[PDB]
Design a protein around this ligand. Structure first.
Ligand SMILES: O=C(O)[C@@](O)(COP(=O)(O)O)[C@H](O)[C@H](O)COP(=O)(O)O
Ligand SMILES: O=C(O)[C@@](O)(COP(=O)(O)O)[C@H](O)[C@H](O)COP(=O)(O)O
Ligand SMILES: [Mg+2]
Ligand SMILES: [Mg+2]
Ligand SMILES: [Mg+2]
Lengths: 102, 451, 450, 99, 183, 99, 99
């Protein structure tokens, strides 16, 4: 199972993930977290972890939510998203955590 | 060979001796005559110029049977003129024809300063020429497998501006949180930021996903409203291809001839038909001039809509309690006695036509649910747009709050509790098991509209 | 994660510093707020609930660009609010969509107790997504071979009740006596006493006979108005098979989506399209509430009608002279400047869309012809229903009286005479050579409307 | 050229015509007169002589109009009609004069 | 209990099974009162007496017709000779026998073509409008509509159907087609 | 898996179930019991426990049948229905037991 | 045979025709003259007498051409036209001479 952007690179460290979160924030995009146990190509709508983080100001905030999502959903794939409301489109999406059975 | 010249309309078209037949279509018109014009003459003008007459005698009147065909004002009571129209004046199955006579020209005469069509008695023999709802309440509940409570829905918001994929994300969150349905806004058709094919495709993915995940059948009222009938049918066809249970039409802005086309297509293609009444208040708001909504609601049931909006009474749009109760009976019952206290000037026998779901929508939230259940009973949709997506935790949480509120009130009613006297307590009890409802109650407890 | 709760509509939807773009659609609404609601909040509510907004803040607002998409009230003058709608808000080519936004729900809010849409500035970039009239005044005059005068018509009477064969007898008498056209009443569709196929067949026999006998091209506005679009198109097809130059639709009772279907059919099949405005006075008459006819007239020209009724001012139905002069310009000119004296709130460019014939009908007779020519000029139809068949000698004589009246007044105007100052005298001169006209003048000389 | 009802009988005399007019009046129908120089099956709409005689009370009044129509149009076929406004249809039509 | 606009449904209830019960040795349906509200779901005649007299331009007498004989066996050209002689002699109409449909000795396309030549000729020669009741009765609805279409192409004012042997569902199909095609 | 009406409330107790049965009976509707091991949205036709209880006079009789259905089918979802033969439609349906 | 605009008035005198030409010129429209021996409703294109008089400055110039067309074609119907190139449409057309 490949997971789209960055899936062909080595699985990202927490530090690498945080750099991508910092890029989302630097560009004024809205970070989000989604998760699923069915990541394949039929699935366009992973489960939201809360709402998109409209009020997030720091990457550490998002990283804490990522850890919270993983602890609650350790059997799931967890992805980080970035949304641009001016284009009305997602501008970055990548998997930050894969479950053990991957 | 004939007596040419202008005669008062009342000479031919005012007949207080006339006894209405069971096959006549009857109208109740509230007339404000031009000062100096007697009520009898103003009412006869309306009768003449909506049936057979004009402003001067014509030789060709004698080539037909005006005693048989003419409309007649047969009673004037206060400011209301009662006018009887023989069955032969109307085209079978055509609301468009009814309108073209009854409301075609008579509202613009100099002799009548204001005119309000309050009600009309559609005769049973004419009603049988109409198909009525494509589905109707009972078959629709069978198709949904939903029995014993009001159904939940909600308009997606913002009205316009979401992309198709994010629009469908909101639909998904609503349906998976416990709404039975969601809908396009009336003005969301096909636009640069959200084109209808994209929306229909993604929305139906979200509908299927929420249905599979909740185990309850779901639908989205995909708006096929468009600039031409052919375009509307093209959009309906795609909704059917995608397996939608529903489409939606703005029946007054699209208009009655295209509405009848969509009703026939929906029936033939297995789709249920939500009818939005956009533009109705242009016609029906003012008490001195226009057409009351109850008349539009009768015509809606005749062409065939499966639901129509009726007002909330308690929400952001105008609607009086008594008149709303009358409209709900007109849409749902087999027979409705007159009651001018509700604006029903005539009795209405529905000739076996299927019933229509009332839809209460607009500015409502969880605190209104006891009143809504009291007003409408089980056979209604309650729609929460802002009242779902405006929940502090978003649309899934908002949907759950609204579903719980409805179920808790239905449960309490069925047990024999007075849901008006105890409405607040019922909601408070339910909120102890439903944090989403507690938060909705806290957020909107100070939001009220006058009633 | 967001600021939930109710906010004032004014916060987002009132912006008095906003400068309208030439691509914006502009509305002038006359607002009667609920007591205690200021104009700014009332106007903002109208703007919000006809564009992007609702009654409480929603999380999903943050997923789009409301500054781009929202309508906004940008100017208030007294009880008139000016609201700008971005071009992107509208479906191309769809009057149905315009109505579903601009007049969809905002007339029924508790906060706004009456509302009247007075005018709308339709931007050129949106107009070009509409085809306009299927024929238009100039091509229509070419198809009729008729130039230099108002065109004569008339509704057949009684409205309902004549058989198809006798209905066409009345048509034959009218057309052979000098009317250019005749028409079905708006409510004559297909009924037990007069079924549409029988009518279409017999009427077209009468049209051809009158055309052969007079040498002038003739037409009858066959009413295809019906209960469904399919049925209207079936009726249109038979009109075309019979070689009718015309069909007719009640564009408001049939409604705008079916009307657009019929316009496309008319264009593709070479038929001209008469539009009757049945139902308009339900909501365009009262000054506090509804939609002014000048907006309906704009929408009519956009979808594509070859003619629309505009009122007479002087006949049995209400109409204001100054407003009607503005509506005639909106229907016929390429560009119409704003004019407060005619209630034209905006300049209107027509983007090259074809023009529509105004049609003056309802309670008029020979004595009104000087006024009608003065108001409308040549590019109009004047219809005489009762004013034709109510002639003491019937419909052929009545038609001749009306045709002579129109021609005598045009002639006099073209010679330089003041047809208002001399109207009675011009008619009296013409009646010296036309006994039909003399008899019509005598019959109706006492019949005036306020 | 046959002319529909009574065309297969000898041409009607004035007295025979008057009896048919009396029949029209007795049944409460409207007598009328129409004429044409083109009587064939293509023509559904002969020329009206005046209007249908809604106000006629006697067959003699109709017969006088028949004589007037014939004096004005001696080159035309002239037919008597009878119209029933309750059925919205002609109930008798026959040629009274052939040129 | 009744389906709108469907004589077939009326029959299927009222006369469907009850005439065969052992409990009832004989049964005769004498009359039925069709209620007005149900009648309005039916279209009635495609033309009707008044419009038909208007289409024929014939007023004030019974109309004349006649079945061509022998019932069967004439060729199409001689069949039309008999039609011509009848119509030009003063009959308003003539008709196919009920059992003349399409057969080896007289096929319907041949008959329709020649009969309409005779109808036009007699109309032109007499000056009175004429018609022939061209029998479209056939084994299937589609075949009946194909024959009706040819009659309309030929400008016949009329077609004919054996409404009970063809049956009420196909009769309703022919009524709708006749109305839509001016027959 | 939600089960339509009352599924968003806490599971009903026997006394709460009995009050809904009393509501069905008070309105003159027909109580019934249905069960299935396949409750999802594809299934319009759960298995009938006996027939709709046309002859039931008390909610206690229905409650006894609910206990019998549950003893026989403890692996199934079991729903109480109420049918209105005047509208020819179900007017209340809810799950009383989940496995 | 009626000939459209002003056909229901008495035949125009030369003075009356000139006034209509003056109206065409006053409005900036282009006067023209056309003629035919087949004026019926099948005929959309009468014969031009010369070209439309783009350069005409006075009504008298047009009347001289009308008289010259009348003298060359006394068996034809002759019509005066006025063309508005800004709307691309004829704005006035009437018969000035009938044979
Ligand atoms: O556009 C709107 O305002 C709504 O979507 C409501 O949104 P909310 O749920 O956020 O209030 C509905 O169309 C109105 O209820 C229609 O009025 P009615 O039902 O009276 O026809
Ligand atoms: O029904 C009628 O009254 C008319 O046929 C007029 O008959 P008359 O000619 O005998 O008066 C027209 O439809 C009205 O003029 C329409 O009103 P408007 O043009 O204002 O839309
Ligand atoms: Mg809406
Ligand atoms: Mg009319
Ligand atoms: Mg036989």
């Amino acid at each position: 199972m490949h997971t789209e952007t960055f899936s062909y690179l080595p699985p990202l460290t927490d530090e690498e993930i945080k750099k991508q979160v910092e890029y989302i924030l630097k560009n004024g995009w809205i970070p989000g977290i989604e998760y699923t146990d069915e990541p394949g190509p039929h699935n366009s709508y992973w489960s939201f972890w809360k709402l998109p983080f409209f009020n997030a100001e720091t990457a550490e905030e998002v990283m804490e939510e990522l850890e919270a999502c993983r602890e609650a959903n350790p059997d799931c794939y967890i992805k980080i998203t970035g949304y641009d409301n001016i284009r009305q489109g997602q501008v970055l999406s990548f998997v930050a955590y894969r479950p053990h059975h991957h | 060979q004939y007596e040419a010249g202008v005669r008062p309309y009342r000479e031919t078209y005012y007949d207080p001796d006339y006894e209405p037949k069971d096959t006549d279509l009857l109208c109740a018109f509230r007339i404000t005559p031009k000062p100096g014009v007697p009520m009898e003459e103003a009412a006869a003008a309306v009768a003449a110029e909506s049936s057979t007459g004009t402003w001067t005698e014509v030789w060709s009147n004698l080539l037909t049977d005006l005693e048989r065909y003419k409309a007649r004002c047969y009673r004037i009571e206060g400011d209301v003129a009662y006018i009887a129209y023989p069955l032969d004046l109307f085209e079978e199955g055509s609301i468009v024809n009814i309108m073209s006579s009854i409301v075609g020209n008579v509202f613009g005469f100099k002799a009548v300063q204001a005119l309000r069509l309050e009600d009309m008695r559609i005769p049973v023999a004419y009603l049988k020429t109409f198909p009525g709802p494509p589905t109707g309440i009972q078959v629709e509940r069978d198709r949904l497998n939903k029995y014993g409570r009001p159904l939940l829905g909600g308009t997606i918001k913002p009205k316009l501006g979401l992309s198709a994929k994010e629009y469908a994300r909101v639909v998904y969150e609503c349906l998976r949180g416990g709404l039975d349905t969601t809908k396009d806004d009336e003005n969301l058709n096909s636009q640069p930021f959200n084109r209808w094919r994209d929306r229909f495709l993604y929305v139906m993915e979200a509908v299927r996903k929420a249905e599979a995940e909740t185990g309850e059948r779901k639908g989205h009222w995909l708006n096929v409203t468009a600039g031409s009938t052919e375009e509307m049918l093209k959009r309906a066809e795609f909704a059917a291809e995608l397996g939608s249970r529903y489409i939606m039409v703005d029946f007054l802005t699209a208009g009655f001839a295209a509405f009848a086309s969509v009703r026939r297509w929906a029936r033939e293609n297995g789709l249920m038909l939500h009818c939005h009444r956009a533009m109705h208040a242009v016609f029906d708001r003012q008490p001195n001039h226009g057409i009351h909504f109850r008349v539009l609601a009768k015509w809606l049931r005749m062409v065939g809509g499966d639901h129509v909006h009726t007002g909330t009474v308690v929400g952001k749009l105008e609607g009086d309690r008594a008149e709303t109760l009358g409209i709900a009976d007109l849409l749902r019952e087999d027979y409705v006695p007159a009651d001018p206290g509700r604006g029903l000037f005539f009795d209405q026998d529905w000739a076996g036509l299927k019933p229509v779901f009332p839809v209460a929508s607009g500015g409502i939230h969880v605190w209104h649910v006891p009143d809504l259940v009291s007003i409408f009973g089980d056979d209604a949709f309650f729609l929460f747009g802002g009242g779902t997506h405006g929940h502090p935790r978003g649309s899934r949480a908002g949907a759950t709050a609204n579903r719980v509120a409805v179920e808790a009130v239905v449960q309490a009613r069925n047990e024999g509790r007075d849901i008006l006297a105890e409405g607040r307590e019922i909601l408070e009890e339910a909120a102890r098991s439903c944090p989403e409802l507690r938060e909705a109650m806290e957020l909107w407890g100070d939001v009220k509209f006058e009633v």
